[PDB]
């Protein structure tokens, strides 16, 4: 029974990633006064399938270390799917008492796939590009962890389903919209999304490729699902759980679509400029707001329950 449940999560995640590539292309297209894919299947609905087949029968074009060349994509894709197993939608696949910490711990491991693939590139210049990407990723891990802790001081625990209870009456975006703003931007920078897509930017100044792409786009969906739960909590009715799933899916779709919207709207940061955005802007505010959110429940007598 449990193995069926795992597959009813793994398979839809990969299908959702496939069709996000179509949605991204069509949303970007219409914001650019054009259409995007509309020939390969009606309204382009077969475009992800054609792309997927094409990439997997392409020539799989020497690695500096075979073990790490293969480890990096397995790590990326395996970790990406793992981040989904504690998500309450409304019931998690695995109900963890410390689910928020688990997601923080697993996400911190994702930078190894960047590091390992840079080592296996066998090229001095690709290793340097990987190290620049790693420095960006760990920099924005700092604010994400501190922002998350600030929010949990209103929730009371590290259990993800408690965020639902915390937002029974009101979305956490209202008491914490300054944190929501930096959290949202931090996720963009964390996933190397525009205007923080410096790996693809700086770089230009088959199956293995597809696998890394699936991992990244799964992370994009997951981060926006996490954002919906963290700040736009949906109400759970235990006798009609599908009502929660519909409302929570719509919010996650809209948050994901706003990632595309933002890509279509702005130029790119310089590397040093996105480092200053973190170390000189977000981190000072995040630290001050962390002190504020430690004090606020105490001074209002609004400390949440431990359980």
Ligand X SMILES: CCCCCCCCCCCCCCCCCC(=O)OC[C@H](COP(=O)(O)OCCN)OC(=O)CCCCCCCCCCCCCCCCC
Ligand Y SMILES: N=C(N)NC(=N)NCCc1ccc(I)c(Cl)c1
53 binds, among ligand X, another protein, ligand LMT, none (CB under 5 to 8 A by kind): ligand LMT
213 binds, among another protein, ligand LMT, ligand Y, none (CB under 5 to 8 A by kind): ligand Y
The least distance separating ligand LMT from the CB of residue 60, rounded to whole angstroms, comes to 7
- Give the end-to-end CA distance of the chain in Å, rounded to a whole number: 29
Q: Long-range contact list for 212-216, CB < 8 A, 24+ apart?
A: 212/72, 212/73, 212/76, 212/77, 212/113, 212/117, 214/14, 214/17, 214/77, 214/80, 215/73, 215/76, 215/77, 215/79, 215/80, 215/113, 216/76, 216/80, 216/191, 216/192
The least distance separating ligand X from the CB of residue 127, rounded to whole angstroms, comes to 23
Please count the residues of this chain forming the interface with ligand X, following the rule CB under 6 A: 22
> Could you give the string, one character per residue 45-84, with x where binding to ligand LMT holds by CB under 6 A and - elsewhere?
-------xx--xxxx-------------------------
Rounded CA separation 228/234 (Å)? 8
Report the helix count and the strand count for the chain, using DSSP H and E.
13, 0
- By CB neighbour count within 10 A (0-12 exposed, 13-18 middle, 19+ buried), where does 37 fall? buried
Does 298 help bind ligand LMT (rule: CB under 6 A)?
A: yes
By C-beta, is 58 or 270 nearer to ligand LMT?
Answer: 58
Does 36 help bind ligand Y (rule: CB under 6 A)?
A: no
Does 258 help bind another protein (rule: CB under 8 A)?
A: no
Tokens encoding 64? 């500096």
Please count the residues of this chain forming the interface with another protein, following the rule CB under 8 A: 149
The least distance separating ligand X from the CB of residue 99, rounded to whole angstroms, comes to 8
Rounded CA separation 197/204 (Å)? 12
Of residues 6-25, those binding ligand Y (CB under 6 A): 18, 21, 24-25
The least distance separating another protein from the CB of residue 266, rounded to whole angstroms, comes to 19
> Could you give the string, one character per residue 220-249, with x where binding to another protein holds by CB under 8 A and - elsewhere?
-x---x------------xx-xx-xxx-xx
> Could you give the string, one character per residue 192-231, with x where binding to ligand Y holds by CB under 6 A and - elsewhere?
------------------x--xx-----------------
Does 257 help bind ligand Y (rule: CB under 6 A)?
A: no
Q: CA angle at residue 47 from 45 to 50, to 5 degrees? A: 130
CA distances from 241 to 35, 168, 229, 244 (A): 37, 15, 15, 5
Please count the residues of this chain forming the interface with ligand LMT, following the rule CB under 6 A: 7
Rounded CA separation 63/122 (Å)? 6
Rounded CA separation 20/14 (Å)? 10
Sequence-separated (6 or more) residues with CB below 8 Å from residue 107: 79, 83, 141, 190
Q: Give the residues lining the site for ligand Y (CB under 6 A).
A: 18, 21, 24-25, 48, 51-52, 55, 210, 213-214
Q: Give the residues lining the site for ligand LMT (CB under 6 A).
A: 52-53, 56-59, 298
Q: Give the residues lining the site for ligand X (CB under 6 A).
A: 96-98, 102, 109, 167-168, 171, 232-235, 247, 250-251, 254-255, 258, 284, 287-288, 291
């Amino acid at each position: 029974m449990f193995m069926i449940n795992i597959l009813m999560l793994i398979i839809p995640i990969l299908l959702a990633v496939a069709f996000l590539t179509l949605v991204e292309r069509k949303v970007l297209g219409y914001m650019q006064l054009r259409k995007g894919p509309n020939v390969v299947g009606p309204y382009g609905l077969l475009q992800p399938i054609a792309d997927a087949i094409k990439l997997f029968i392409k020539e799989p074009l020497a690695t500096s270390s075979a073990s790490m060349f293969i480890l990096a994509p397995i790590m990326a894709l395996g970790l990406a799917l793992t981040m989904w197993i504690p998500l309450p939608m409304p019931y998690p696949l695995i109900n963890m008492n410390l689910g928020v910490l688990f997601m923080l711990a697993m996400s911190s491991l994702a930078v190894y796939s960047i590091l390992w693939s840079g080592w296996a590139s066998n090229s001095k210049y690709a290793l340097i590009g990987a190290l620049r990407a790693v420095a960006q990723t760990i920099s924005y891990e700092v604010t994400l962890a501190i922002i998350l802790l600030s929010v949990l001081l209103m929730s009371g625990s590290f259990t993800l389903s408690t965020l639902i209870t915390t937002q029974e009456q009101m979305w956490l975006i209202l008491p914490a919209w300054p944190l929501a703003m930096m959290w949202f931007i931090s996720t963009l920078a964390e996933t190397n999304r525009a205007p923080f897509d410096l790996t693809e930017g700086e770089s230009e100044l088959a199956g293995p490729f597809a696998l890394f792409f699936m991992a990244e786009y799964a992370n994009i969906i997951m981060m926006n699902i996490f954002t919906a739960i963290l700040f736009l909590g949906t109400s759970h009715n235990p006798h009609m759980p599908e009502l929660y799933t519909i409302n929570f899916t719509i919010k996650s779709l809209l948050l994901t679509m706003s990632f595309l919207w933002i890509r279509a709207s702005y130029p790119r940061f310089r590397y040093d400029q996105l480092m200053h955005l973190l170390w000189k802007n977000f981190l000072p505010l995040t630290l001050a707001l962390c002190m504020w959110h430690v004090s606020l429940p105490i001074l209002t007598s609004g400390i949440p329950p431990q359980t």
